[PDB]
């Protein structure tokens, strides 16, 4: 399992994606859905690792020196949207919702 939080470790923070507010009216439904993401530290463990970790944020903040706080379990969502041919499709779009957050 994983940990779920709101308001320290690799925890799940909820986030509602609004396609209206984003300005993507081409997707009819859902206008809004609870999506979530993963934030927090991933390993301690011992200790000579700290220089390699600290050096990572200096070179590339997008870089990972070890396990990352990434979603483990992801659920799909059913979506109604306009296609670039003037038609409206219903589709099962995979991995839209984050269900669990763990360390890689």
């Amino acid at each position, epitope marked *: 399992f994983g940990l779920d939080c709101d308001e320290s470790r690799c925890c799940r923070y909820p986030l509602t994606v609004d396609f*209206e507010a984003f300005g993507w009216d081409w997707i009819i439904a859902p206008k809004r859905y609870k999506a979530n993401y993963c934030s927090g530290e991933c390993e301690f463990v011992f200790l000579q690792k700290y220089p390699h970790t600290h050096l990572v944020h200096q070179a590339n903040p997008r870089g990972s020196a070890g396990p990352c706080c990434t979603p483990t379990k992801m659920s799909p969502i059913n979506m109604l949207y*306009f296609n670039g041919k*003037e038609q*409206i499709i219903y589709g099962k779009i995979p991995a839209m919702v984050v269900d669990r957050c763990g360390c890689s």
Partner: antibody
Amino acid sequence: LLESGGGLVQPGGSLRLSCAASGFTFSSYAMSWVRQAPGKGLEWVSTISSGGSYTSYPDSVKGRFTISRDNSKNTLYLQMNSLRAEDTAVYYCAKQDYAMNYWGQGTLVTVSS
Amino acid sequence: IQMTQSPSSLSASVGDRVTITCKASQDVSTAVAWYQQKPGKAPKLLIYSASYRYTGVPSRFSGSGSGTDFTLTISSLNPEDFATYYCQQHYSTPWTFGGGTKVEIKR
């Protein structure tokens, strides 16, 4: 949702329907027009995106009808041009989500000579 | 692109369990919607995405299906349930509807 603008028109003629949205944020909701000929409907007429940029129509009304909206006026429009007798129906405006949730009472459009 | 509706009409009394089906000419996943229309009034949404009940819709109404064969189920008919019922397909445009099912009050 309140429709208005429907009455008698001659074939080959034009008519512009309007739909008054109130009690919700219209500019954030995708809209639809659906008709019912006396016996017995229902038929999809057109769908419009929340912003208005995207529109889809069936081959039965495509090229003749145009779904439009003015989010500042909280109104949905249907410009019906090159009208045929087969377009005689009660015209409903509705909110578009996965399906038409909340429909207006409608407006009857009669196309005859 | 068709949607064929089960018994065009049906007679029943209060409490009777009613089963209304709807068949699609092609595979339409779970993109089916059920509506309820009464004489002189605009239709009301019952079910969307084949099984999802809309807000306010009583628990006694329930949709089930996937692919081609879909069903609407009225567990225990109430006086206000006697109306016409329509199926639809929110799968791919043009969106096509069912013929309708008139639910008559038997006397």
